[PDB]
Amino acid sequence: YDLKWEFPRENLEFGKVLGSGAFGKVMNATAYGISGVSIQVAVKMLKDSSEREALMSELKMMTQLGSHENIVNLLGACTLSGPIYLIFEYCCYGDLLNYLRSKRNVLTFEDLLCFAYQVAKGMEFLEFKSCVHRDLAARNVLVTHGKVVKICDFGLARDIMSDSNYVVRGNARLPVKWMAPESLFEGIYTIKSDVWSYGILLWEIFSLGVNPYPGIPVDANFYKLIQNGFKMDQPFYATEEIYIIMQSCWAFDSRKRPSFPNLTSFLGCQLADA
Amino acid sequence: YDLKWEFPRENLEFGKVLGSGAFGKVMNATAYGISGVSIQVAVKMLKDSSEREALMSELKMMTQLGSHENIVNLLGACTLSGPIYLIFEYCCYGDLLNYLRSKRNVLTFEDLLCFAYQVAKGMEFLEFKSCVHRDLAARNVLVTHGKVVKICDFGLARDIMSDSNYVVRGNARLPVKWMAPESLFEGIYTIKSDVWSYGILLWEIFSLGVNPYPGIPVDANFYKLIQNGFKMDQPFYATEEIYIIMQSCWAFDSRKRPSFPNLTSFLGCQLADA
Ligand SMILES: CC(C)(C)c1cc(NC(=O)Nc2ccc(-c3cn4c(n3)sc3cc(OCCN5CCOCC5)ccc34)cc2)no1
Ligand SMILES: CC(C)(C)c1cc(NC(=O)Nc2ccc(-c3cn4c(n3)sc3cc(OCCN5CCOCC5)ccc34)cc2)no1
């Protein structure tokens, strides 16, 4: 743990709560001298030592990572004289899933294309840094000024007990509709697992925030539907090209899916034309 | 049949034979006053009235079609005082399949990308004109000056009795490895059937002319292999992007394949980058 991250907690001026869960929360705050004179920041904190580490493990993970434009970037932390705080960039428009739903500032197709592009840029970065995201969805992407989007993970700051998209499977509560077959049936999580999730995230964007596999519940039939190769139909705001791209992320063989460098090229092409 | 097509057969100066079959042939010739003062042309002709029409039906089909750059274009015809001739543009480098094989003028990846692009341009044209090609392969594409490629059909000017890629199935001899499942199992031939063939043609280009499904013979197992969703692995000269594109042409559902306008956009993007 580098010392340059350590930020005076007294310089933090707390505002409203941005998200809450059973383990922890994300507050909004004003931080003096971390950038102007002060900026808006988002602060992660807890509310049990089995999770005092899971935060600390997130702390060292975010510092090793390095910054990217399409990632919620760490600015500082408080880890010495009191409770642990992780200080992030503030994304004033909240998560992408709600942002899309509320937009049903006017929203164009090219914006949709941009959102998709930036997320693939951000996952390309993670691929390079050799990370996997175990919960990649639209709800785990934030929106800031200038239609910029940043990938994040609420993790302990989301109440999964009351989120219907997290389904009890085995000794856990998982976001099943976003998960790859190897994840579901072998507990495997790779960058290509993320690619499958990205495909679902594309569906989320170009449906404008419709729940994946709409009208289909998560029961015994769903797992056999996925396992027999079921794929969603085209979402309303998808072009023909995008749907094909979206479909490649859903190859049952994880080896047959595109990489994120591939996805960035495919979507870069679409942006240049659109 | 418009009269502007009618060309004086005396103005034709015949050279070598460019292709032969059981029904007819394609001669090379010099035609005076059909364009310079004279040009090289390719002439289709027969060698039985059940095929005197199949040629005449090709004649009226090529005149209704209109010209495109990536199509072997009709220039004139002789249909009044003697045997029927159809006068086409001359493509001096022969068919694309041999051209690739002999190149194993130096050949670059971007040329490969261009070949693929032009063929999709040409099939996009046919799609618009509401035609299907029932035999789309690399062997049915010609190469001219400037690395330009033009789609064609030898048809009666190819000896299928001695071409191992035409397999006896039912009461016919068909190019099985290039054929879509609906074609094979329902006798259906649509523009999306052509899309599947285009996928195989891509494989041909980026393998540099390797026979599709190499090491796999056309027997009972092959039809059940295709029917159970078997797809070729990546050809040696394919990039990651191209393979994904190539794979979309092979969706078992014909409705899930890209259109040719789609393919042109996908490959146009790749050209712009490469
Ligand atoms: C990606 C990677 C590296 C794997 C990772 C990240 C990670 N860790 C994290 O991503 N941590 C983290 C950091 C910040 C946030 C976060 C949430 N919000 C903001 N930052 S800014 C914000 C603003 C919000 O609402 C504003 C008002 N809106 C408009 C009006 O209506 C209400 C909504 C709501 C939530 C919200 C979440 C998680 N650990 O690993
Ligand atoms: C597409 C559509 C509309 C469905 C269609 C087309 C259609 N009908 C047709 O496409 N007809 C047609 C017209 C021309 C040719 C043809 C063949 N060749 C040429 N034109 S120019 C040429 C030159 C060749 O060799 C030159 C020397 N090479 C280099 C040295 O080694 C030897 C080889 C060989 C073949 C050849 C084929 C078919 N009917 O419908």
Side-chain angles (χ1 to χ4, degrees), chain A residues 241-259:
Chain A
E241 282 87 328
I242 279 164
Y243 185 48
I244 291 154
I245 293 177
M246 187 181 306
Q247 283 178 275
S248 65
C249 291
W250 294 333
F252 199 83
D253 204 340
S254 63
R255 286 132 47 207
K256 293 298 178 190
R257 294 168 214 164
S259 70

Side-chain angles (χ1 to χ4, degrees), chain A residues 131-149:
Chain A
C131 300
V132 310
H133 201 312
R134 282 189 306 230
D135 191 22
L136 175 64
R139 70 182 162 276
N140 268 327
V141 180
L142 309 176
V143 193
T144 348
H145 295 277
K147 310 280 186 51
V148 178
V149 299

Side-chain angles (χ1 to χ4, degrees), chain B residues 16-19 26-28 41-44 58 61-62 65 70-73 86-95 98 122-123 125-126 131-134 140 142-143 150-155 157:
Chain B
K16 58 171 188 170
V17 179
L18 304 180
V26 177
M27 309 279 300
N28 158 256
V41 301
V43 199
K44 229 189 196 169
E58 179 182 339
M61 115 94 60
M62 282 309 284
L65 236 211
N70 309 122
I71 308 279
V72 177
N73 301 289
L86 313 196
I87 316 184
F88 293 88
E89 297 172 330
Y90 178 67
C91 295
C92 45
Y93 296 113
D95 70 281
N98 276 306
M123 289 299 299
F125 177 76
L126 289 186
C131 300
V132 310
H133 201 312
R134 282 189 306 230
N140 268 327
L142 309 176
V143 193
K150 290 166 179 296
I151 305 181
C152 71
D153 193 339
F154 290 79

Side-chain angles (χ1 to χ4, degrees), chain A residues 264-266 268-269 272, chain B residues 110 241 268-274:
Chain A
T264 287
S265 302
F266 274 142
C269 171
Chain B
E110 300 182 353
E241 282 87 328
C269 171
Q270 295 290 124
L271 249 182
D273 295 16

Side-chain angles (χ1 to χ4, degrees), chain A residues 240-241 243 256 262 265 269, chain B residues 240 243 256 262 265 269:
Chain A
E240 295 186 353
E241 282 87 328
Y243 185 48
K256 293 298 178 190
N262 290 156
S265 302
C269 171
Chain B
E240 295 186 353
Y243 185 48
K256 293 298 178 190
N262 290 156
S265 302
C269 171

Side-chain angles (χ1 to χ4, degrees), chain B residues 22-83:
Chain B
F23 319 114
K25 64 181 161 183
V26 177
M27 309 279 300
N28 158 256
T30 299
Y32 295 84
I34 195 168
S35 175
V37 297
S38 80
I39 61 178
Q40 286 303 290
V41 301
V43 199
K44 229 189 196 169
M45 57 187 64
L46 303 166
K47 288 149 73 115
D48 191 318
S49 259
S50 175
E51 311 135 62
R52 192 165 214 163
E53 297 178 346
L55 184 70
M56 283 300 300
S57 290
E58 179 182 339
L59 174 59
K60 288 172 189 173
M61 115 94 60
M62 282 309 284
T63 55
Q64 290 286 315
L65 236 211
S67 69
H68 189 265
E69 189 188 348
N70 309 122
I71 308 279
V72 177
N73 301 289
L74 185 75
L75 303 168
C78 307
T79 69
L80 303 182
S81 81

